[PDB]
Enzyme design. Structure first.
Site, short mmCIF file in Angstrom:
data_model
loop_
_atom_site.label_atom_id
_atom_site.label_comp_id
_atom_site.label_asym_id
_atom_site.label_seq_id
_atom_site.Cartn_x
_atom_site.Cartn_y
_atom_site.Cartn_z
N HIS B 53 -1.78 50.60 111.99
CA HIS B 53 -1.59 51.61 110.95
C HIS B 53 -2.94 52.26 110.67
O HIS B 53 -3.97 51.58 110.74
CB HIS B 53 -1.14 50.99 109.60
CG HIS B 53 0.14 50.20 109.65
ND1 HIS B 53 0.18 48.93 110.12
CD2 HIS B 53 1.42 50.52 109.32
CE1 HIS B 53 1.47 48.52 110.09
NE2 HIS B 53 2.25 49.46 109.60
N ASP B 56 -5.16 50.08 108.59
CA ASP B 56 -5.68 48.84 109.18
C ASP B 56 -7.00 49.12 109.93
O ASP B 56 -7.86 48.22 110.03
CB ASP B 56 -4.73 48.36 110.31
CG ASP B 56 -3.33 47.97 109.88
OD1 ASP B 56 -3.15 47.52 108.70
OD2 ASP B 56 -2.43 48.11 110.70
N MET B 87 0.44 52.60 120.84
CA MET B 87 1.25 53.01 119.68
C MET B 87 0.35 52.96 118.44
O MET B 87 -0.53 52.12 118.32
CB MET B 87 2.46 52.05 119.54
CG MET B 87 3.38 52.34 118.37
SD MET B 87 2.84 51.63 116.78
CE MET B 87 3.50 49.95 116.93
N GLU B 180 11.73 53.01 112.81
CA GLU B 180 11.95 51.58 112.72
C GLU B 180 12.90 51.28 111.56
O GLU B 180 12.50 51.40 110.39
CB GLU B 180 10.61 50.89 112.48
CG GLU B 180 10.74 49.37 112.41
CD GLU B 180 9.47 48.64 112.52
OE1 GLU B 180 8.42 49.30 112.81
OE2 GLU B 180 9.47 47.41 112.27
N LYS B 182 15.12 48.93 108.93
CA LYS B 182 15.08 47.61 108.29
C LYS B 182 16.10 47.65 107.17
O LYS B 182 16.19 48.68 106.49
CB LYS B 182 13.69 47.32 107.69
CG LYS B 182 13.51 45.88 107.23
CD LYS B 182 12.14 45.62 106.66
CE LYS B 182 11.94 44.16 106.34
NZ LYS B 182 10.59 43.92 105.75
N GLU B 216 13.21 46.04 115.51
CA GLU B 216 12.50 44.78 115.37
C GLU B 216 13.52 43.64 115.32
O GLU B 216 14.49 43.70 114.56
CB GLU B 216 11.65 44.76 114.10
CG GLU B 216 10.93 43.42 113.90
CD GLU B 216 9.95 43.38 112.70
OE1 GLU B 216 9.12 44.27 112.68
OE2 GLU B 216 10.13 42.43 111.93
N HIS B 219 14.38 42.37 111.85
CA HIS B 219 15.04 43.35 110.95
C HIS B 219 16.54 43.38 111.17
O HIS B 219 17.32 43.32 110.22
CB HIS B 219 14.43 44.72 111.15
CG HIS B 219 13.05 44.82 110.66
ND1 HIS B 219 12.33 46.00 110.70
CD2 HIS B 219 12.22 43.89 110.12
CE1 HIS B 219 11.13 45.79 110.21
NE2 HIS B 219 11.02 44.55 109.82
N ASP B 244 9.73 45.91 118.70
CA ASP B 244 8.95 44.92 117.99
C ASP B 244 9.62 43.54 118.15
O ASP B 244 10.78 43.34 117.79
CB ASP B 244 8.82 45.23 116.50
CG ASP B 244 7.83 46.28 116.11
OD1 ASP B 244 7.10 46.78 116.96
OD2 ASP B 244 7.81 46.62 114.90
N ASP B 254 11.94 38.74 105.47
CA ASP B 254 11.43 38.96 106.81
C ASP B 254 10.37 37.93 107.10
O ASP B 254 9.27 37.94 106.51
CB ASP B 254 10.89 40.37 106.63
CG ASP B 254 10.32 40.92 107.76
OD1 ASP B 254 10.79 40.61 108.89
OD2 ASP B 254 9.48 41.86 107.58
N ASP B 256 8.88 37.12 110.21
CA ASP B 256 7.84 37.52 111.14
C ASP B 256 7.29 36.30 111.90
O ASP B 256 6.09 36.18 112.18
CB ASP B 256 6.72 38.27 110.43
CG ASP B 256 7.12 39.75 110.18
OD1 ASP B 256 8.23 40.24 110.62
OD2 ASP B 256 6.44 40.35 109.32
N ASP B 286 5.28 42.19 116.51
CA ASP B 286 5.04 42.44 115.09
C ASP B 286 5.41 41.14 114.39
O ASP B 286 6.56 40.89 114.11
CB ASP B 286 5.85 43.58 114.54
CG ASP B 286 5.54 43.83 113.09
OD1 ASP B 286 4.65 43.19 112.54
OD2 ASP B 286 6.24 44.64 112.44
CO CO Z 1 7.90 45.99 112.72
CO CO Z 2 9.49 42.23 109.98
#
Ligand code: CO
Ligand code: CO
Ligand code: CO
Ligand code: CO
Ligand code: CO
Ligand code: CO
Ligand code: CO
Ligand code: CO
Lengths: 386, 386, 386, 386
Positions: B53, B56, B87, B180, B182, B216, B219, B244, B254, B256, B286
């Protein structure tokens, strides 16, 4: 006193009030209903019409003369009551032949049969005056990963729906299709599991204008989704051709409770949306009176579907008309949500220092949305606590 | 020994291995990582590239000279290691200004700022060589029904994505967007909650060819959906622009988790599908190393993502190549699933007595699908128990 | 007009209205609140009292003189307003030291520290007049199977609670403990995930009478469970020592919406049960004003918690008092549910031919339960549609 | 090659392999199986025994001479094969008389009948050698809040189980009861919805030692719970009297997939726990071969249950025996988890400055748990990728 009349356009499937109460774990608790009796009872409650799968109206495997007699009796009941038949559908899920699907069965001969069975009933639907033909592919899917190549299955699903579109076009019918998503049950995962997946699929059909969705409250809620939001996306796409109303408590088996049961606030926001949007299709109930009930309880549960819709309609209208709510909506910037972001165009946005170089992010961040006051006004209106 | 190399095209977000461990209920458990260090560490593990991002890579609120220096250091790390940046994406969720959304904020000034912030980072992404620009609208949605009119929000969302398409076209960039979905978290319900909803939305954009999805694993699993099935529908639509990879245990927050954790069999079927389909995009992770871990555990968790993909790749390939599996697939009629239902055309199907009048439904019903034997071959291959 | 007063016994955690809005994905949207201000604001709304974790009242790491001053200011605010402190608790989840747990951390030194931190705050709780000491072991659990042997962890959990019971007994305190279950979040799975698991665990403590449960609406709903049913089982066990009221929409992250939001009908049945049972503990709200809100919205959301409880209290009382409902309850055999099955004893039941040999199962089966009419009376009362 | 033999103690219900394939939406796909044939087929696969509901072995409503003949034939099949009958149970859910429950039906006459029906079958179970008598109260619960007062229902449930305990004591039987929780399905919510709730209830029975739990993999997973964790709590309580093994994909209808299907990693950790704990009861499969299958697929699915258990047993044993895993377990402080927190006693803990005043929280916080490396060793062992 929230009394429905046929002008309210409430409809019911024959299989709803006619459900005998068999479940995963249980034998029937009620005798079978003659469709004639259900038409009569529903009309007395103030329903507008009824809907059917082929095999609810004519027992599977009927001869031509039996078929004719079942249809004749049903037509007489419709004529006796003034009830309409706005929608019909095919049963592509009960008979064991459909254990791996109708349109996406791995066996090609089953796919062809499913199409023939559907086409036969489209003709009947049109004869009975139906505007909408629903398709719930409840057997399309899998319990295991190797059993079903989903790209191949979607190819088969598109062929099937394209053939049905060719058929109605060839006959000059004014019927349209409404695809009903469901995420699971009876298959471990069902293809086209949500409103979104069905909307996306339709865009790839040969004649997308012939197809929309038939979303069901409880189906989207079986995926934990927001049913009003999904209905909004269907309306945004111009694809809400029909709707199935019932109740569900979250992520479980499909409960098919009466409308208003299950997630009551979601029922409120759904009614608010349908009425705000001017949805003009039937308000169809696809529900099951619980198997605890006798016939008196069947009719009470059906009546409750309509009553709850009418109560919620009153409360949502009062909410939207209340000048204190109108002020709260402005305080929460719902008016601004409805204004274009950049009707000035891309270059003007790029050259607008108020949008970046001179945007005070902290001042904007500090402005509260006032959503809790708005939502408590909504609660107060729903509960009749203003 | 399942060792990844850059040829495997494994990528990681800076925010993955760089997650400091703050959660709903918890302070950071690890110090911040310099992006330069993460590039170096990931390259040593055999990664192909990294993603970011805006915020980041360049702290929010940086001056031009700070920006330049952050980018210079990052570029040096990429050059030192051979790592790519396939990306990039925008952070339209952390800063409080985005508390009601970026592109669908009720405040119009916030919507315009979100677009400017995105456009600035598209330019940077292109400079760093990115082919794909992801958009996760994590703040688009609501906790209450009155706060967000979803039709209006979708109008705003379409305007935003159409403006971004106009922008990339105007600049002659070869970057494409990947939306994306979610279902929830951090908003009570998020707009475009699943792959299907995002695919459907894209079809209504001005230039649909510029947009695909970035699904993802976790998600879709937060809605209880079958992730391989959703990926199949995205591939069927030609819209799998990025993916993802991570792990999730069902309907929760989530998680992850590292890829392969969570639903292991779904990870197997996902790899099988990506490899069968010849997906050629990055295999992007991700994920978040759990906050229990120190940095050694961060790098172990990252390595495990890649290892699990490679193990599953081997087992899925062995499954598909096994002549006993090939025979089982024919026994289950997967070959027949891939054949057109009615290439003979509608009229021939209507005139085919083998499809209705002379179809032996009982004989077809009696034929078992043999799916359990097929699935146990799949299990045996996954577990190395053949 | 549903106005709360201190007699209603509504309480709030400092961390509720004081939540600054940080989430998985987001920075704070509101400044920190001084506890003195929250006591004042809550009293003005008609609250009865407030609750605290140690670290909400005294910043972690405070010196003795800072501690004394924080407590002095808080005590003055309580005295200025008449607010009470009925419950306190320990923060065994925020600091990174607790990343694997407090009482069930794998590190023994952390387990011992968690106990010392708890004991220090029990002393403070008693000084401030608290009757109940809550324990939410939010870090007790795991993301992976090998990380936590649950039998060993339960041994450690029992030791910890037994030591705390020995401590309060040794001091002659009249405080009791209330264990708060949650199924997941922040750990992948939390130990004692539901009311049932916590009730079962308590029975194995050395002095079970010192311990009960503190169930939270949203926590049980995160497992898809019926919160009123779980409260009924806790009341049946004599173990409802405290309760946390809020709203949740099903199987998601813990939303902490205001009470009445989320599952409205479950909120109705909960209030009905608490009031029917004569629960005399605090009606405590463990909620978070959404981060969209400013301080005015914080106080509106808090006020809404109490308002919704009072509306639901009125409607549930009216339901139970309505002679038409009383008749419907008899028609549904709720009176018979409350009669012993076999007060005549085992041998009489064995010798009773009406119970087997001469029981007409078909006649009993045919008798409808009349539950739908009863439930629509309940709906009508909730909605003020009688 | 993972071949089961009777020494492995694998058992199956008659209703598992005998399921004809009727579901919510579907007619039977397979003919009924004679219990004699199922005993023969299961023995050929290497099963140890079979289990039954009353009404699976003797059709409901059978005369005494029909009963005798059904039992005689079954006994001959057991004798012909060496198969055992370790467990039996009552069907208190299929017949419409049980539509509101057996032991907690609102109708008292139904409650008394349910007890008589159960007692009759306890006698038969003992004759056939069963050690365990399961009770799954699948109809105990509600679809609506007013229909069932849960405190009253728990009073009735306790009376029923206490009467059954009095009965077995009076007869001098060595049979024990195992209560099977389930959260929902077929009722909207079922009483005793999880392992925890059932364990808690048992503690309030008159003779708790006579009762334990019969947890089912898929049932706990229908609440999104960690099945191995719940089994650990049951083992900690000394209450794992029986277990039902199958597969489930999360929060759905009860899928009853073969064991190893559904959540594969949870199946691994379950086997690891049962084997580590030295569970000596039957490994019972309560599953349904999918209705897609013919009889050959039924037997393949049954064989797969046992095969998957044996593969997972091998891999879990290898994991625990691997010295690299043993080192990783020490690195993650699993050894320290198993040590008492404060065997030195309360006063010593209070006087221990290393536990508070001189505890370096930052140094402890910085120590990583090393759980990801441990979990990847577990993954590598499961997948045969060491
Ligand atoms: Co993601
Ligand atoms: Co997630
Ligand atoms: Co449904
Ligand atoms: Co429907
Ligand atoms: Co909570
Ligand atoms: Co709480
Ligand atoms: Co089950
Ligand atoms: Co079972």
């Amino acid at each position: 006193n929230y009394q429905p009349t046929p002008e309210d356009r409430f409809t019911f499937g024959l299989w709803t009030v006619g459900w005998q109460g068999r479940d995963p774990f249980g034998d029937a608790t009620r005798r079978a209903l003659d469709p004639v009796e259900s038409v009569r009872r529903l009309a007395e409650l103030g329903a507008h019409g009824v809907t059917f799968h082929d095999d609810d109206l004519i027992p599977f495997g009927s001869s031509d003369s039996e078929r004719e007699e079942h249809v004749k009796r049903f037509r007489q009941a419709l004529d006796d009551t003034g009830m309409k038949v706005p929608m019909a559908t095919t049963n592509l899920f009960t008979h064991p032949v459909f254990k791996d699907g109708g349109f996406t069965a791995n066996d090609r001969d089953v796919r062809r049969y499913a199409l023939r069975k559907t086409i036969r009933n489209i003709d009947l639907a049109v004869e009975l005056g139906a505007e909408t033909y629903v398709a719930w592919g409840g057997r399309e899917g899998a319990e295991s990963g190797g059993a079903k190549d989903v790209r191949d299955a979607l190819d088969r699903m598109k062929e099937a729906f394209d053939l049905l579109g060719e058929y109605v076009t060839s006959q000059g019918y004014d019927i349209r299709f409404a695809i009903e998503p469901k995420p699971n049950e009876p298959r471990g995962d069902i293809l086209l599991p949500t409103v979104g997946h069905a909307l996306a699929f339709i865009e790839r059909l040969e004649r997308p204008e012939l197809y929309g969705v038939n979303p069901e409250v409880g189906h989207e809620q079986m995926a934990g989704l927001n049913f009003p939001h999904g209905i909004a996306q269907a309306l945004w796409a111009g694809k809400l051709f029909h709707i199935d109303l019932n109740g569900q408590n979250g992520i479980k088996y499909d409960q098919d409770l009466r409308f208003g049961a299950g997630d009551l606030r979601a029922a409120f926001w759904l009614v608010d949306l349908l009425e705000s949007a001017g949805y003009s299709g039937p308000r169809h109930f696809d529900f099951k009176p619980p198997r605890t009930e006798d016939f008196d309880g069947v009719w009470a549960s059906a009546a409750g579907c309509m009553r709850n819709y009418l109560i919620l309609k009153e409360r949502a209208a009062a909410f939207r008309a209340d000048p204190e709510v109108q002020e709260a909506l402005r305080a929460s910037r719902l008016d601004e949500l409805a204004r274009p972001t950049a009707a000035d165009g891309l270059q003007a946005l790029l050259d607008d220092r108020s949008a970046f170089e001179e945007f005070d992010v902290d001042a904007a961040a500090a402005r509260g949305m006032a959503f809790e006051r708005l939502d408590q006004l909504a609660m107060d209106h729903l509960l009749g606590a203003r």
